[PDB]
Design a protein around this ligand. Structure first.
Ligand SMILES: C[C@@H](O)[C@H](N)C(=O)N[C@@H](CNC(=O)CCn1cnc2cc(Cl)c(Cl)cc2c1=O)c1cccc(-c2ccc(C(F)(F)F)cc2)c1
Ligand SMILES: C[C@@H](O)[C@H](N)C(=O)N[C@@H](CNC(=O)CCn1cnc2cc(Cl)c(Cl)cc2c1=O)c1cccc(-c2ccc(C(F)(F)F)cc2)c1
Ligand SMILES: [Zn+2]
Ligand SMILES: [Zn+2]
Lengths: 401, 401
């Protein structure tokens, strides 16, 4: 009903097996949703002027030791050896992004440098606590690291906040709770650096007219963060978005740029993820929509179906027209009752069933039925195709009227 | 000089480092090429009616023992541990595809089932034998597995062959050498099975009029194979494409389907890759074109630039029009001589440089120069966008002549 594990099996989206705990086998229709979510995030990366990179799955333990994560999260990390050398399977993309930053001399002119990745990460999570798409070992982050000057933090965090609300609004999430985590007991740098760092986050939120609250002392060793919690239609809370300042990692991994005064400077790093885990976010959307994915996300967006054998060639032509228009379409030409076809494709949550009887063929029209069971009547083929295209392009939550 | 390592560095496509031997860091412009190559393969996967899936990064050694690969190739696999269980970092995507197949009741009607994946694979290759993008440890296979009946092998091998030549021709590779490897001494199945299997591959090639040389006795124990070697402009051989029959793995991993007789039967598996390694193929393409990527592959397709500040608004408007047309375009309004700007974009292998002087603004035109140094003169903006769109959508090797 609103259980992603049930709807997942029903609509053949994914499965999982004990041979690979907390690592998703993505089926055809599930990978289609995942890929369309990737396309959506890429459109925002372009709109917000991000680079997109791809880093390796493993790097030398020696490199991960310099990050500080080895001492604190070695037991959460998958390791493998080759030729007397130990490698970590990446649980995070940040050190990989610094390696790309460190290729070539960097100028103040290159900042802010926004580096995004659909980062395939692995964490050695306890098998006992693995739950569907929500708690996994293998996950994909809508990740990015911004390399910038201290002066650029406010503007860069401002743009991250807009991107968060922009992207959440697409999926109909308008109730957002925002928490700013402040300096912990054990922290790096002066109290002044923290005053300015916390001020930068607070002013960025203020600039966007966003009310928030503090989580006192919950900040990381290496800087303060903003966390965003969205509420689904059941008013259940999901923490997804994070904007994390980092005054540690660049220095640790010898990241530098030639300042405007010609002095070598360490860049500030901003970690940010909006959806968080792509798998978890699909899990949340599955329950939010109860399998009724918005048309732009639907594995199959349209099924064209004949009442009798007589409309088979009209269905073939219309299916080709929809295919050419970039719509994910199937023809249902089975020797079955129109009622049987509608019920089957309604149960599979296909947004639109385009029904062709003799009256539709003769007029060059099509009868449109929604998965909600509404009959929109008979409309011109080209006018329907243009409307379906508009709904998909605009990533509309709503169907045709 | 056409070294992919040199071009990769110069055009900021990728880098590799000692902390990650034989594993690629894709920079913004290299990842753009990678994704366009992915987009191309998907267009073929659709045309040849392939499902696309995603399998897990690692699986229990216990499953890899059932395949028979552990006894033979354990030293060529990366392994990691969790909760007293040994996991193999997948060196191949076949076992994972069988797991997805095994989920849900499969009948004769569901065959042939064509399952494609951009499969992230790892092999523990000696670090001494690594070089460039040609011999790596982490690679992405344009992999697919076809689950079919003995009756369907011929037709399915036929489409595999058509797809291979279809794809190699897109990149201008017409010199293809083909090898069929027959019965080894130690093998499974009857001589009659091998007679039919070797005939299926041989008749498929003969009907397609593909000259091939038999590699007598060099076939795999689990079935025969076709291997495709393409030649670049330096006449260097690259063994990229494979079609391998397998009458072993489906049985070993409990793969079965309900036949026309309503009784269970083991499906025949066809292992099929065309590009082989997406990374090696980009390396070969980089050298083949010496960085002059066809327009559809070019990281940046168009630069629009002004003579003086007077044409700045016309340039920004043309940039937006080209962007809306689906073209990777950048604006160059810098206060630099036209000869300086054109040299920078020519060095970066930008296919098209669009120059806006007063005469271009007045007449609603644009001056078009190719990176080869051909001046196509002053042409109507809309006619140019249509020509560029056509060149990109057709995936033309050639620029406007
Ligand atoms: C935005 C990115 O650039 C950033 N690098 C990052 O990954 N931030 C963390 C949230 N931050 C932390 O948890 C920091 C503390 N922490 C927590 N766990 C760790 C675990 C490991 Cl193995 C390592 Cl190496 C480091 C850490 C570590 O530093 C984050 C943000 C959003 C989603 C997730 C997430 C990760 C895993 C899951 C899953 F396990 F699948 F359920 C779900 C969600 C994590
Ligand atoms: C088409 C696919 O579905 C098929 N499963 C497959 O992977 N075919 C093999 C060619 N076939 C063989 O190599 C068979 C023999 N062989 C050889 N080496 C192995 C090594 C390991 Cl670790 C394992 Cl588990 C199995 C094998 C194994 O079976 C293939 C085809 C094309 C390219 C590659 C390839 C090989 C090496 C690299 C490398 F450079 F190392 F990164 C990159 C790509 C491999
Ligand atoms: Zn990070
Ligand atoms: Zn295979």
């Amino acid at each position: 009903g609103r259980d992603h594990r049930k709807i997942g099996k029903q609509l053949d989206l994914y499965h999982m097996q004990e041979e690979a705990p907390g690592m998703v086998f993505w089926h055809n229709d599930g990978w289609t949703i995942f890929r369309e979510l990737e396309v959506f995030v890429r459109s925002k990366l372009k709109e917000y002027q991000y680079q997109e990179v791809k880093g390796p799955f493993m790097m030398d333990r020696v490199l991960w030791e310099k990050t500080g994560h080895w001492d604190n999260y070695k037991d959460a990390m998958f390791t493998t050896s080759s030729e007397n050398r130990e490698y970590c399977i990446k649980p995070m993309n940040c050190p990989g992004h610094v390696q790309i930053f460190n290729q070539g001399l960097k100028s103040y002119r290159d900042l802010p440098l926004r580096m995004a990745e659909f980062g395939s990460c692995h964490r050695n999570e306890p098998s006992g606590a693995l739950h569907g798409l929500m708690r996994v070992r293998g996950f994909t982050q809508d990740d990015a690291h911004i390399f910038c000057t201290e002066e650029q933090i406010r503007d860069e965090v401002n743009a991250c906040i807009r991107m968060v609300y922009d992207m959440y609004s697409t999926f109909g999430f308008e109730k957002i709770v925002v928490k700013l985590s402040t300096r912990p007991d054990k922290r790096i740098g002066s109290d002044e650096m923290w005053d300015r760092a916390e001020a930068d986050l607070a002013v960025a939120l203020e600039e966007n007219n966003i009310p928030f609250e503090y989580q006192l002392g919950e900040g990381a060793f290496y800087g303060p963060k903003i966390e965003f919690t969205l509420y689904d239609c059941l008013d259940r809370a999901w923490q997804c978005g994070t904007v994390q300042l980092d005054f540690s990692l660049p220095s640790r991994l010898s990241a530098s740029y030639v300042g405007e005064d010609n002095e070598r400077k360490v860049p500030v790093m901003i970690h940010r993820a909006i959806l968080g885990s792509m798998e978890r976010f699909i899990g949340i959307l599955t329950e939010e929509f109860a399998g009724f994915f918005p048309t732009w996300l639907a594995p199959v967006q349209v099924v064209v179906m004949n009442i009798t054998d007589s409309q088979s060639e009209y269905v073939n032509e219309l299916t080709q027209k929809l295919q050419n228009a970039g719509i994910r379409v199937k023809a249902d030409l089975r020797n079955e009752k129109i009622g049987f076809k509608i019920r089957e494709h309604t149960l599979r949550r296909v947004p639109y069933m385009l029904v062709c009887g003799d009256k539709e063929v003769e007029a060059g029209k099509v009868a449109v039925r929604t998965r909600r069971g509404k009959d929109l009547g008979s409309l011109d083929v080209n006018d329907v195709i243009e409307k379906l295209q508009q709904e998909i392009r605009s990533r509309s939550l709503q169907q045709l009227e």
